[PDB]
Design a protein around this nucleic acid. Structure first.
Ligand code: ADI
Ligand code: CA
Ligand code: MG
Length: 341
DNA sequence: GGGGGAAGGACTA
DNA sequence: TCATTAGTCCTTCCCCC
């Protein structure tokens, strides 16, 4: 198999630069303003001029401003980025029928039936990068390899505005030399448990007793890492179908007062229903982020679709369960709908 | 023993 | 007054066959 992965560069910030070219070359920070206080919220993404200085996805907006007080700070306009993304995803459909849209700015294309080798794969990558630049003036990074994982790693290595092929020989080299924390699916918690076992490279999972690996990181992650290390990882590119749709908002102030929480919960339901657009969910979950930042949730599955009115009444009973079973104050509240008919 | 659900846990972008 | 938003797959605990 030959997989070609496309990863749009610093996407939300790049879209803002396309819509306002005077922003080019300047640090641009796209933020999720929570409304609690002046600049409360976090950075969704920043362009590379901003990242060079440490301003990146995830940090508090107030911290970003301490580092780059004069950067351009813009509020996230998700619908705009989603419309631009949808147009780019339609351009990709022309290069393969087998495409897995992984997120708003990533797609995997199985081009095995389209090219004969990596030289042709690389040329198709350039064609794709050019097509997207021509139509939308958006740069992207292409990663190419024998499976999804390494195609993604190739993109991580080459972004931004790059293209890279990780051939069979390099895959073998990476299995020996790539820091295992850089393998997709291995976050800080798993990376720490692996460091602690002396596992710093994929190759190392082949010499540890399987049960010892599994006991520390779980059966699925152990089998995953071992299959990559044996160069036997096989996961097909498959059309993705959304399995859940939801909305979670931040409250002005923390609370565990039902009447004070309701308006936020109801606004989350209204927005979620708008997003469902014709999809009819059989399940609803109320999700709360507590003051200390833990996530708590309660849900219910019905034998039939949930009308908006049933969503309103059931969300209140589920929120009560959360309040009745957890004594902490709530910071963010929302709903998630799933099990579509 | 293990299918299936609810809720938490990690991780991703 | 640091700490968003959204979605996916896995683990754990429990009921149940
Ligand atoms: N921490 C985050 N919170 C919210 N959105 C995020 C976060 N991290 C990434 N994203 C979203 C926003 C832009 C979209 C793609 O990200 P971007 O292209 O900037 O990532 P990268 O440069 O790593 O490719 O993913
Ligand atoms: Ca990207
Ligand atoms: Mg990592």
């Amino acid at each position: 198999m030959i997989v070609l992965f496309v990863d749009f560069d610093y996407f939300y910030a790049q879209v803002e630069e396309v819509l306002n070219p005077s922003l080019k070359g300047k640090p641009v920070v796209v933020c999720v303003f929570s409304g609690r206080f002046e600049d409360s919220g976090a950075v969704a993404t920043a362009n590379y001029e901003a990242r060079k200085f440490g301003v990146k996805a995830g940090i508090p907006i107030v911290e970003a401003k301490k580092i780059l007080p004069n950067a351009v700070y813009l509020p996230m306009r998700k619908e705009v980025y989603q419309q631009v993304s949808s147009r780019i995803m339609n351009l990709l459909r022309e290069y393969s029928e087998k495409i897995e849209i992984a997120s708003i700015d990533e797609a995997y294309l199985d081009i095995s039936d389209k090219v004969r080798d990596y030289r042709e794969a690389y040329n198709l990558g350039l064609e794709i990068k050019n097509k997207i630049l021509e139509k939308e003036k958006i740069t992207v990074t292409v990663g190419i390899s024998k499976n999804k994982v390494f195609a993604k790693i190739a993109a991580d290595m080459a972004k931004p505005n790059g293209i890279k092929v990780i051939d069979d020989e390099e895959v073998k080299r990476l299995i020996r030399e790539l820091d295992i924390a850089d393998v997709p699916g291995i976050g800080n918690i798993t990376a720490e448990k692996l460091k602690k076992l002396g596992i710093n490279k994929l190759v190392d999972t082949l010499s540890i007793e399987f049960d010892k690996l599994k006991g520390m990181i779980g059966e699925a992650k152990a089998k995953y890492l071992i299959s990559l290390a044996r160069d036997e990882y096989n996961e097909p590119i498959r059309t993705r179908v959304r399995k859940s749709i939801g909305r979670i908002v931040t409250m002005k102030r923390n609370s565990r007062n039902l009447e004070e929480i309701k308006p936020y919960l109801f606004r989350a339901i209204e927005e979620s229903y708008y997003k469902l657009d014709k999809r009819i969910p059989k399940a609803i979950h109320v999700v709360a982020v507590t003051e200390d930042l833990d996530i708590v949730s309660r849900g219910r599955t019905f034998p039939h679709g949930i009308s908006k009115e049933t969503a309103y009444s059931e969300s209140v009973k589920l929120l009560q369960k959360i309040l009745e079973e957890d004594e902490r104050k709530i910071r963010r509240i929302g709903v998630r709908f799933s099990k579509f008919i």
